[PDB]
Motif scaffolding. Structure first.
Motif, PDB file in Angstrom:
ATOM      1  N   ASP A  38       0.809  -1.217   0.000  1.00  0.00           N
ATOM      2  CA  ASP A  38       0.000   0.000   0.000  1.00  0.00           C
ATOM      3  C   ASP A  38       0.845   1.270   0.000  1.00  0.00           C
ATOM      4  O   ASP A  38       2.070   1.212  -0.122  1.00  0.00           O
ATOM      5  CB  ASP A  38      -0.945   0.030   1.201  1.00  0.00           C
ATOM      6  N   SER A  39       0.190   2.422   0.155  1.00  0.00           N
ATOM      7  CA  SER A  39       0.846   3.720   0.053  1.00  0.00           C
ATOM      8  C   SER A  39       0.007   4.756   0.784  1.00  0.00           C
ATOM      9  O   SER A  39      -1.202   4.839   0.554  1.00  0.00           O
ATOM     10  CB  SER A  39       1.029   4.117  -1.411  1.00  0.00           C
ATOM     11  N   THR A  40       0.645   5.555   1.646  1.00  0.00           N
ATOM     12  CA  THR A  40      -0.092   6.417   2.562  1.00  0.00           C
ATOM     13  C   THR A  40       0.095   7.913   2.358  1.00  0.00           C
ATOM     14  O   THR A  40      -0.751   8.677   2.835  1.00  0.00           O
ATOM     15  CB  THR A  40       0.276   6.093   4.017  1.00  0.00           C
ATOM     16  N   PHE A  41       1.177   8.346   1.695  1.00  0.00           N
ATOM     17  CA  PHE A  41       1.617   9.748   1.594  1.00  0.00           C
ATOM     18  C   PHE A  41       1.869  10.398   2.953  1.00  0.00           C
ATOM     19  O   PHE A  41       1.812  11.622   3.069  1.00  0.00           O
ATOM     20  CB  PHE A  41       0.641  10.630   0.796  1.00  0.00           C
ATOM     21  N   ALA A  42       2.164   9.620   3.988  1.00  0.00           N
ATOM     22  CA  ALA A  42       2.413  10.167   5.312  1.00  0.00           C
ATOM     23  C   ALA A  42       3.590   9.431   5.925  1.00  0.00           C
ATOM     24  O   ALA A  42       3.884   8.292   5.569  1.00  0.00           O
ATOM     25  CB  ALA A  42       1.182  10.057   6.216  1.00  0.00           C
ATOM     26  N   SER A  43       4.254  10.086   6.868  1.00  0.00           N
ATOM     27  CA  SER A  43       5.515   9.583   7.386  1.00  0.00           C
ATOM     28  C   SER A  43       5.367   8.770   8.659  1.00  0.00           C
ATOM     29  O   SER A  43       6.355   8.194   9.116  1.00  0.00           O
ATOM     30  CB  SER A  43       6.471  10.745   7.652  1.00  0.00           C
ATOM     31  N   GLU A  44       4.177   8.729   9.250  1.00  0.00           N
ATOM     32  CA  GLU A  44       3.904   7.925  10.432  1.00  0.00           C
ATOM     33  C   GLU A  44       2.482   7.408  10.334  1.00  0.00           C
ATOM     34  O   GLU A  44       1.600   8.081   9.797  1.00  0.00           O
ATOM     35  CB  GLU A  44       4.069   8.720  11.736  1.00  0.00           C
ATOM     36  N   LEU A  45       2.264   6.206  10.855  1.00  0.00           N
ATOM     37  CA  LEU A  45       0.946   5.586  10.879  1.00  0.00           C
ATOM     38  C   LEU A  45       0.597   5.207  12.307  1.00  0.00           C
ATOM     39  O   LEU A  45       1.394   4.564  12.993  1.00  0.00           O
ATOM     40  CB  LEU A  45       0.887   4.351   9.975  1.00  0.00           C
ATOM     41  N   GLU A  46      -0.580   5.623  12.756  1.00  0.00           N
ATOM     42  CA  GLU A  46      -1.056   5.303  14.090  1.00  0.00           C
ATOM     43  C   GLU A  46      -2.301   4.436  13.999  1.00  0.00           C
ATOM     44  O   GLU A  46      -3.085   4.542  13.053  1.00  0.00           O
ATOM     45  CB  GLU A  46      -1.354   6.566  14.896  1.00  0.00           C
TER      46      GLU A  46
END
Lengths: 51, 51
Positions: A4-12
């Motif tokens: 996958d791919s989020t365009f963000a540098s951290e995932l909570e």
């Protein structure tokens, strides 16, 4: 697992989990010419955690 | 005779804060640097008017 791919540098991760009240408490035994009795008090609770 | 004066200045943004900073309330997919440079671009115009 695939990708996958989020365009963000951290995932909570937030997990709201609920323990609802079970529908126990059968029925009180009555006779036809008398008044009823009240029903006991239940408990429900919530909880939430973080990763 | 008459001869002018010179004045100029600079500012640099490094690699960490370009992709790591979002807003402080919500979750953001890394676009706040474009907001923050355009203020800083406007600020240096106010520097030369102040000078």
């Amino acid at each position: 697992f695939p990708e996958d791919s989020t365009f963000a540098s951290e995932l909570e991760l937030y997990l709201l989990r609920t323990q609802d009240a079970e529908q126990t408490g059968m029925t009180f035994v009555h006779q036809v010419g008398s008044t009823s009795l009240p029903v006991e008090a239940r408990v429900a609770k919530v909880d939430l955690a973080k990763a | 005779t008459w001869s002018p004066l010179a004045f100029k200045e600079s500012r640099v943004w490094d690699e960490k804060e370009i992709l790591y900073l979002g807003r402080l309330a919500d979750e953001v997919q890394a676009g706040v640097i474009n907001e923050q440079i355009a203020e800083s671009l406007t600020w240096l115009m106010a520097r030369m008017r102040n000078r």
